């Protein structure tokens, strides 16, 4: 579960 960056 690659998680999108929080600034994405």
């Amino acid at each position, epitope marked *: 579960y*690659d*998680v*999108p*960056d*929080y*600034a*994405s």
Partner: antibody, heavy 120, light 114 residues
């Protein structure tokens, strides 16, 4: 101690390429995402590329797209920026800071840069 | 790019004196989702990689000495040392951490009165 340790920033002619590595400890690299950040000679620092914790999600500014690529290596447990087609204005110190996943609070952990100098 | 403006490029300061510094954004950094303006303040010394003092405008890092108060919300923002020390004379930056591209603010350098 988390430890990010950079290498690769040489003096290459513009139009050339440079690869940079950044080493990680004190955490499971796989859980957090890495970024590369440059500090220019007049000392403004600017975000070069951001990845995620395994890959896929690759992020860059428009200054960088085309030339640079951020990579990962979870067993060698190392972060790389492939920089290519070097303009002189790329000359900067390159830091691999990291992305604070759980908390959201910046770049609290920076390695101690690898100076990229591109000159003819 | 969400553009961060830091002012002033410098600020003189005696010691044991309250100093405030600023940053501003074109857009705003505040999301409703989490309920936070994502403007992180950094501090830097020659030789030294910058470090996180405040994150989310207002919230101080672990270790950051309590003189360091956060504020600013939306588009204009503030960095406030209630009582400056030798050990605080350094360049301070600000950053849109809200949304890519992550932009930082130009610089405000502390240099002390003589």
């Amino acid at each position: 101690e988390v430890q990010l340790v950079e290498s690769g920033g040489d003096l290459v002619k513009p139009g050339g390429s440079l690869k940079l590595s950044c080493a990680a400890s004190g955490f499971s690299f796989s859980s957090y995402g890495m970024s590369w950040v440059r500090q220019t000679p007049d000392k403004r620092l600017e975000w070069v590329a951001t990845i995620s914790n395994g890959g896929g999600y690759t992020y860059y500014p428009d200054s960088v797209k085309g030339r640079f690529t951020i990579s990962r290596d979870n067993a060698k447990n190392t972060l790389y920026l492939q920089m290519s087609s070097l303009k002189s204005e790329d000359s900067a110190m390159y830091y691999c800071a990291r992305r604070e996943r759980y908390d959201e609070n910046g770049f609290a952990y920076w390695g101690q840069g690898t100076l990229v100098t591109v000159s003819a | 790019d969400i553009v961060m403006t830091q002012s002033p490029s410098s600020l003189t300061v005696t010691a044991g004196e309250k100093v405030t510094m600023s940053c501003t954004s074109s857009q705003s950094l505040f999301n409703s989702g989490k309920q936070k303006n994502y403007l992180t303040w950094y501090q830097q010394k020659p030789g030294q990689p910058p470090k996180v003092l405040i994150y989310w405008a207002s919230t101080r890092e672990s270790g950051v000495p309590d003189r360091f108060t956060g504020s600013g919300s939306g588009t204009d923002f503030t960095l406030t040392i209630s009582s400056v020390q030798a050990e605080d004379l350094a360049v301070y930056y600000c950053q849109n951490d809200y949304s890519n591209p992550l932009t930082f603010g130009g610089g405000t350098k502390l240099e002390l009165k003589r």
